[PDB]
Amino acid sequence: QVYMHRDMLPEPRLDDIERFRQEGFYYTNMLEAPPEIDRVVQYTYEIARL
Amino acid sequence: FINKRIVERVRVGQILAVLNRRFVAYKGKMRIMDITQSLKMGTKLAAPTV
């Protein structure tokens, strides 16, 4: 399971700095779960060649 | 006797009549290259062919 997808880096608001006693918005590549198959595009070298 | 117009009597203004022939000349911009030595065995193409 390794995919590529145009993803924004979380740029959070900072009004209550103290509220950042939160999990300091860790962010990760680690998907909680994979994508909907009908939304994915399976590539073989073969196709990429063409 | 040869039945081929080797030496011919001409007027003068008729001199240039010779023109006649077509002629197609590759523009200076282009490069003519013989792809004949690119027939090595270990070369694979992206477009598989029959």
Curated annotation (Swiss-Prot), chain B:
Please report any disulfide bonds recorded for this protein chain, giving both cysteine positions: none
**Taxonomically, which superkingdom?**
Viruses
Q: Tell me where it resides.
A: Virion
Annotated TM spans: none
Functional summary from the UniProt entry: The VP3 protein is one of the five proteins (with VP1, VP4, VP6 and VP7) which form the inner capsid of the virus.
The UniProt similarity line reads: Belongs to the orbivirus VP3 family.
Q: What is this protein called?
A: Core protein VP3
Q: Which organism is it from?
A: Bluetongue virus 1 (isolate South Africa)
Which portion of the entire protein is included?
A: 852 to 901 of 901
